[PDB]
């Protein structure tokens, strides 16, 4: 139960499954699919996320988010990855803890809205109470190859980057709570004019290479 304070690598091609966990239940909240295992499928070196029609469940779409056991503290995070394109879904890499561990909502997010994949999202939480969506312009199409993505979390900080260089920098209400880092892959319920209406358009399908965690050091 340490929070996690060395470098942790976990390359989709060849890791540690054992350090995570396959969701298997219903986020709720404005995300219309329930988690199921069997959509986090690895395949060509990399780990997929497929939202698909579910058939006789209480939700009307079934989608994957895959987690890591252990929490990490302050430093830098990276995603390479290759998001999903269609009008009103969610592609994401994340930091998450709240109530399940006790924790207040501290969250980092940085969230792919199909509806428009030559833009990335980055947004955060601090004790539950988000309101800093920061949409930047990639200047490429994040649905059409992998690139990678990250951020260094610290305690007055956060700093984006995309393909190893930084392009933001969020200091309001900055999280406290080492969390989980986590990926997902849903539509939209209630958040119309956020991520465009769901077409109800299936399979669809967003895929990881790896997750990077570096206690210490920035590219």
Same mark, same amino acid.
């Given at each position: 139960?340490? *929070? &996690?304070? $060395?470098?942790? *690598?976990?390359?989709? /091609?060849?890791?540690?499954?054992?350090?995570?966990?396959?969701?298997?239940?219903?986020?709720? /909240?404005?995300?219309?699919?329930?988690?199921?295992? #069997?959509? +986090?499928?690895?395949?060509?070196?990399?780990?997929?996320? $497929?939202?698909?029609?579910?058939?006789?469940?209480?939700?009307? @779409?079934? /989608?994957?988010?895959?987690?890591?056991? #252990?929490?990490?503290?302050?430093?830098?995070?990276?995603?390479?990855?290759?998001?999903?394109?269609? +009008?009103?879904?969610?592609?994401?890499?994340?930091? @998450?803890?709240?109530? /399940?561990?006790?924790?207040?909502?501290?969250? =980092?997010?940085?969230?792919?809205?199909?509806?428009?994949?030559?833009? +990335?999202?980055?947004?955060?939480?601090?004790?539950?109470?988000?309101?800093?969506?920061?949409?930047?312009?990639?200047?490429?199409?994040?649905?059409?190859?992998?690139?990678?993505?990250?951020?260094?979390?610290?305690?007055?900080?956060?700093?984006?980057? &995309?393909?190893?260089?930084?392009?933001?920098?969020?200091?309001?209400?900055?999280? &406290? $709570?080492?969390? %989980? =880092?986590?990926?997902?892959?849903?539509?939209?319920?209630? &958040?119309?004019?956020?991520?465009?209406? @769901?077409?109800?358009? $299936?399979?669809?399908?967003?895929?990881?290479?790896? *997750? %990077?965690?570096?206690?210490?050091?920035?590219?």
């Amino acid at each position: 139960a340490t *929070v &996690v304070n $060395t470098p942790f *690598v976990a390359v989709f /091609s060849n890791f540690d499954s054992s350090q995570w966990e396959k969701a298997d239940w219903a986020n709720g /909240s404005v995300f219309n699919c329930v988690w199921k295992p #069997s959509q +986090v499928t690895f395949s060509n070196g990399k780990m997929i996320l $497929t939202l698909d029609r579910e058939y006789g469940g209480s939700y009307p @779409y079934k /989608s994957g988010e895959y987690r890591t056991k #252990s929490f990490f503290g302050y430093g830098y995070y990276e995603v390479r990855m290759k998001a999903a394109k269609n +009008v009103g879904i969610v592609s994401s890499f994340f930091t @998450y803890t709240g109530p /399940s561990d006790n924790n207040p909502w501290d969250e =980092i997010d940085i969230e792919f809205l199909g509806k428009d994949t030559t833009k +990335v999202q980055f947004n955060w939480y601090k004790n539950g109470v988000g309101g800093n969506e920061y949409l930047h312009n990639l200047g490429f199409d994040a649905s059409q190859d992998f690139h990678t993505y990250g951020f260094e979390w610290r305690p007055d900080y956060i700093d984006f980057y &995309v393909d190893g260089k930084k392009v933001y920098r969020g200091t309001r209400n900055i999280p &406290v $709570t080492p969390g %989980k =880092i986590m990926m997902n892959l849903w539509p939209g319920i209630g &958040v119309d004019e956020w991520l465009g209406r @769901y077409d109800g358009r $299936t399979p669809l399908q967003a895929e990881y290479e790896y *997750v %990077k965690y570096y206690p210490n050091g920035v590219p």
